[PDB]
Design a protein around this nucleic acid. Structure first.
Lengths: 105, 204, 233, 125
RNA sequence: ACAGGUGCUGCAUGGCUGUCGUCAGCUCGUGUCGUGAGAUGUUGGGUUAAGUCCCGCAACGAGCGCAACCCUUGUCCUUAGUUACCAGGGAACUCUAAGGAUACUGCCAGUGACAAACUGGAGGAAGGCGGGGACGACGUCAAGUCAUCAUGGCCC
């Protein structure tokens, strides 16, 4: 399973890399059927008419066998964006895994 | 998202506002000098109400046909203001070009004049929807089968810009044989630029 | 023509109500009895109300007023059309469009479109049109004629309405109450007599019976017009 | 001297028909010498042999444009048109095989943002 | 004075663009119903590529979308015949490029609510949207663009 962590308009640091890798390996612990992960960390605006609050973005496009789920999170701080993105991705992994497991019965 | 109403109708029910032929080497020079003429004359005749201008030209001289609703101010007293512009037109253009002025019988049916009037009011700080409704009313009573005017930007000075449009009548954009006049000008307000688009539909 | 006879009303069968389970309890005064689970309308009452209705339509037609004949029932459409045309009166016989009278300013556009289509088919404009396009314009004309053929010459709201089967024409009754225009109606044992001024308790389901009431109304309006034409000279 | 014009893809064959032996002259050369592909060889003789008269007419065919099977189809269509020009009762039997209907199929233009008329650039998921 | 700035802000904007999506939708006027937000129309029976069409129906109508008008291709006709063509100098043919004809469920047989429509057949080059393209609704994503250009503010 691949893990790509790109950064648009921001310099991704070692701390950002760790803060994405630790959560990715946590989701990949419960789901072992993930093909690829691509996480883009962006700074999509300057908050010129709202004072931030959505200035940083963290998006995750993950590909599983037969499906592709994308999640995104806007936030003032990039670390909080990363955590919210990770939580959405974990919830979607759980949703897909339980649907697939309940399709057998 | 929407094609230009005149551009998509150029060959079906409409006509270009330039009617000269040039060899591939001459096309660049003719078009560049033509665009320069248009820009200079549109900046010079800002005070007057001038609609589409047809810069058509034979070999040598040219015949520039300007359509307006203020012929007196354009021409001047006994042709004293048309000739002063004639000399400059020849001075920057090639062989002396004759400029003739045509009259717009119904200024409320020309999409350019309506758009520029809306823009002038907006620049003079007239309430935006007041201007929209005034223009729609005038044009829809002046015989137009349909009008649609669209304002875009910081309407009134709002931080968050928006688009407000007003339709009355048909204005069937997707029909090619519609004879839809269109204009898109800008009002330079103290809080930025407002985009003023006007569609006027008047038959087949 | 101002009075109706009970003998031919009984012969037509205007006293046959519905079964004794669909009746409206507000029809108790007019119901004479129940014969084999069927309500019998009191001929005395229907004739007494019919005389007043005929007097009212005589007085209305003597003043060049318009009373609109409403009935879309399968046993009333053709008869309503015939007698309304005979009396020269507007009618609806196929379907009461919602808002016929409360939205008459919008029905004006459809009426005008129909009339200008009549003009274009009368002056022979089909020699300038195509084959199928003229056919579809003609089809549009006929479709509008079905809906609003009898009310094209109405020229305003009617001064009274004559409805057959109030229960069936409840929308027309509601509009009449909305606009205040009087409504005389034939109302059966199962129907609601409310919102109706000149109620005629009678059987509205038999074509033979409906013909009697509609012809009587037409004859009364005709007599009123004829009398109103006697003071010209 | 019954002449017919046939067209296919891009070729346009002008064929002249005369009652004769069966000499077929495709653009100045015999049929078998001009057409090196047997598939394109059948198509020219298909209408003649359909109604059982291969060696009954001298054909003067001039093809222009098109490839090697488009030209054969154009020649077949032109021969069909000349045969129906010769006889109208030929058409009822020569129509059931679809030899008189012009084939309007043509190279679909390359559309923008596409590799070909229909082919789309790939994108991995 | 200023000029200049490919300096910042596309989350202050205009203009232009992508995208859902050429998906069949999105609305409004008047009327009616509801204290009201709202509803109805726009739902239902069919039918269609299509809110396409018909029929019902408290709705009656309208607008933007759909379709058509546009380009090209497929058959034929007319004007014209060079630098094009070549059947016998020719004015036939191919071709070139302007104007037109044709196609409309027009006809037949059925099914279908006495309907819209559908199924098949003839003729025809083409049959039911003949093939392809242009045309991209209200809006969505604070989507892209201040580096095409213009532009408020900030800054050198």
């Amino acid at each position: 399973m691949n893990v790509t962590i790109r950064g648009h308009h921001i310099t991704v640091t070692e701390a950002m890399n760790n803060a994405v890798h630790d959560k990715l390996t946590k989701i990949a612990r419960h789901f072992d059927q993930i093909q690829s992960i691509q996480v883009i960390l962006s700074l999509d605006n300057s908050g010129a008419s709202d004072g931030g609050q959505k200035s940083h973005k963290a998006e995750a496009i993950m590909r599983v066998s037969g499906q592709e789920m994308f999640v995104q999170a806007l936030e003032d701080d990039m670390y909080k964006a990363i955590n919210e993105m990770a939580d959405k991705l974990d919830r979607q992994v759980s949703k897909y895994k339980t649907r697939l497991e309940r399709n057998k019965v | 998202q929407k094609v230009h109403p005149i551009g998509i109708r150029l060959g079906v029910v409409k006509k270009h506002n330039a009617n000269w032929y040039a060899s591939p080497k001459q096309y660049s020079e003719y078009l560049i000098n033509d665009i320069q003429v248009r820009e200079y004359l549109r900046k010079k005749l800002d005070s007057a109400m001038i609609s589409n201008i047809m810069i058509e030209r034979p070999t040598g001289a040219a015949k520039i046909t300007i359509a307006t609703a203020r012929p007196g101010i354009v021409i001047g007293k006994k042709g004293e203001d048309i000739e002063r512009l004639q000399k400059e037109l020849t001075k920057m253009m090639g062989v002396p070009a004759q400029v003739n002025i045509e009259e717009i019988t119904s200024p409320d049916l020309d999409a350019r004049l309506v758009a520029d009037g809306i823009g002038s009011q907006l620049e003079r700080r007239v309430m935006f929807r007041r201007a929209m409704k005034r223009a729609v009313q005038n044009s829809m009573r002046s015989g137009a089968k349909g009008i649609k005017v669209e304002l875009s930007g910081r309407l009134g000075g709002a931080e968050i810009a928006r688009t407000e449009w007003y339709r009355e009548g048909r204005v069937p954009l997707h029909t090619l044989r519609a004879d839809i006049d269109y204009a898109s000008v800008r009002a330079e307000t103290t809080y930025g630029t407002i985009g003023v688009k006007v569609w006027i539909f008047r038959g087949e | 023509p101002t009075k109706i006879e009970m003998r031919d009303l009984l012969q037509a069968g205007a006293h046959f109500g519905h079964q004794t389970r669909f009746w409206n309890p507000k029809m108790g005064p007019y119901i004479f009895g129940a014969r084999n689970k069927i309500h019998i309308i009191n001929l005395e009452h229907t004739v007494k109300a019919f005389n007043e209705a005929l007097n009212y339509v005589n007085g209305l037609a003597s003043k060049k007023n318009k009373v609109l004949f409403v009935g879309t029932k399968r046993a009333a459409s053709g008869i309503i059309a015939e007698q309304a045309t005979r009396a020269g009166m507007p009618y609806v016989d196929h379907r009461w469009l919602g808002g016929m009278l409360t939205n008459w300013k919008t029905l004006r556009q459809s009426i005008n479109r129909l009339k200008e289509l009549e003009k274009q088919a009368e002056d022979g404009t089909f020699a300038k049109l195509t084959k199928r396009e003229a056919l579809e314009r003609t089809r549009d004309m006929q479709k509008l004629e079905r809906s609003l053929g009898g009310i094209k010459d109405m020229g305003g709201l009617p001064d009274a309405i004559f409805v057959v089967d109030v229960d069936h024409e409840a929308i027309a009754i509601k509009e009449a109450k909305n606009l205040g225009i009087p409504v005389i109606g034939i109302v059966d044992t199962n129907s609601n007599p409310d919102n109706v001024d000149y109620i005629i308790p009678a059987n509205d389901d038999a074509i033979r019976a409906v013909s009697l009431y509609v012809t009587a109304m037409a004859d009364a309006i005709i007599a009123g017009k004829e009398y109103a034409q006697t003071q010209a000279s | 001297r019954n002449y017919g014009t046939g067209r296919r893809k891009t070729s346009t064959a002008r064929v002249f028909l005369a009652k004769g032996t069966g000499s077929i002259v495709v653009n100045g050369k015999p049929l078998d010498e001009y057409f090196s592909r047997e598939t394109s060889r059948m198509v020219v003789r298909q209408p003649l042999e359909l109604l059982d008269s291969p060696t009954a007419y001298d054909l003067y065919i001039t093809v222009k444009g098109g490839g090697i099977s488009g030209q054969a189809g154009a020649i077949r269509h032109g021969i069909t048109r000349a045969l129906i020009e010769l006889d109208d009762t030929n058409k009822p039997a020569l129509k059931a095989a679809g030899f008189v209907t012009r084939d309007s199929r043509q190279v679909e233009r390359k559309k923008l943002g596409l590799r070909k008329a229909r082919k789309r650039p790939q994108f991995s998921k």
